Write a protein that binds this ligand. Structure first.
Ligand code: 8XB
Length: 345
């Protein structure tokens, strides 16, 4: 029963020589050797059974990754668990090991324009597939963009992923959110639950900007501070953009603010490619309806080098409706997780 950093991993014997990777609220990631395929891999221990929300996240994640099959998206090789619902205390996801993530990379390395262009392509390529399955990742960030030595990119961490529900997007002003702050679309703060594809595009824009200068573009310190950062660069939203925000609290807040001028991208990123900045402008659009879509982003002159519609696959079977796990209790969600994982026993 090998243990890592005070956490015990019941994964043997197939997996040996464990090494720590990352720690999550209700999970932990480590590396290990797989004696049945003769290479080291990534193993994620998930202990979501004490909380209901975690059980929900876990079920959605497993279900999505199981269906998904794409070069730029992390898959599941195996799942380790107790043979009975009773003895199941943890769930272990086995996945391909990647050398590093973009977050770790941006901390220490300057990226060449060639690297930025290629990374962005693979992110959009993966995202095209995700969105084609009517799925929103909802938490894209450098830390869940994994890379290897040959600069291949894989998307991971589908904990907050959900089936898109555009019709049920509307919400009040300042409604709480779970996704990482720095990468939250401005609409989250004003009128959106983040149930539309456009929010993933905002995140990719923030990542592109971060790739450009190695610093987050909108590092807010709290819910509202995030909005101010965005507005401090994007400038005051126009009359047309305000007309799409009908809830009064949000609109009256924006109208209460002093006029702020747009900060020109070329001023923020003086070394950047001008086509890259043109695309960055389209991804980072205040109005979600005017925001560039993933397939449009791929066809952008900045990515002309890798653009190929034929080699940008889409999902064979899209997800129909979001699972009704909101009302489900821990115990029953323990049962569905058990069943979804039966195939690997
Ligand atoms: C605890 O759950 C929280 C969510 N979460 C994961 O799901 C997850 C999966 C990996 C992973 N990481 C590597 N490699 C990697 C990255 C950095 N360093 N090295 C070695 N390879 C393969 C995988 C699948 N990393 C994480 C950390 C966070 C984002």
């Amino acid at each position: 029963p090998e243990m890592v950093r005070g956490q015990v991993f019941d994964v043997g014997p197939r997996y040996t020589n464990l090494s720590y990777i990352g720690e999550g609220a209700y999970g932990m990631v480590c590396s290990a050797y797989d004696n049945l395929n003769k290479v080291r891999v990534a193993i994620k221990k998930i202990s979501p059974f004490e909380h209901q929300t975690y059980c929900q996240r876990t079920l959605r994640e497993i279900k999505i990754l199981l269906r998904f099959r794409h070069e730029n998206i992390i898959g599941i090789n195996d799942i380790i668990r107790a043979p009975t619902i009773e003895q199941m205390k943890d769930v272990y996801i086995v996945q391909d090991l990647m050398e590093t993530d973009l977050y770790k990379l941006l901390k220490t390395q300057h990226l060449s324009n060639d690297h930025i262009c290629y990374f962005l392509y693979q992110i959009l390529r993966g995202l095209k597939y995700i969105h084609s399955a009517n799925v929103l990742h909802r938490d894209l960030k450098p830390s869940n963009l994994l890379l290897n030595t040959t600069c291949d990119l894989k998307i991971c961490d589908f904990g907050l992923a959900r089936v898109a529900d555009p019709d049920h997007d509307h919400t009040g002003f300042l409604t709480e959110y779970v996704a990482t702050r720095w990468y939250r679309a401005p609409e989250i703060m004003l009128n959106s639950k983040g149930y539309t594809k456009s929010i993933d595009i905002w995140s990719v824009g923030c990542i592109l900007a971060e790739m450009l200068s190695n610093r987050p573009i909108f590092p807010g310190k709290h819910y509202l501070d995030q909005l101010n950062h965005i507005l401090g660069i994007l400038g005051s939203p126009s009359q047309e953009d305000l007309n799409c925000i009908i809830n009064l609290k949000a609109r009256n807040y924006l109208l209460s603010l002093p006029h702020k001028n747009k900060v020109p991208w070329n001023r923020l990123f003086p070394n950047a490619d001008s086509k890259a900045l043109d695309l960055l402008d389209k991804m980072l659009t205040f109005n979600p309806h005017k925001r560039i879509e993933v397939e449009q982003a791929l066809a952008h002159p900045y990515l002309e080098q890798y653009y190929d519609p034929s080699d940008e696959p889409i999902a064979e079977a899209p997800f129909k409706f979001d699972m009704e796990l909101d009302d489900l209790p821990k115990e029953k969600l323990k049962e569905l997780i058990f069943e979804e994982t039966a195939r690997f026993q």
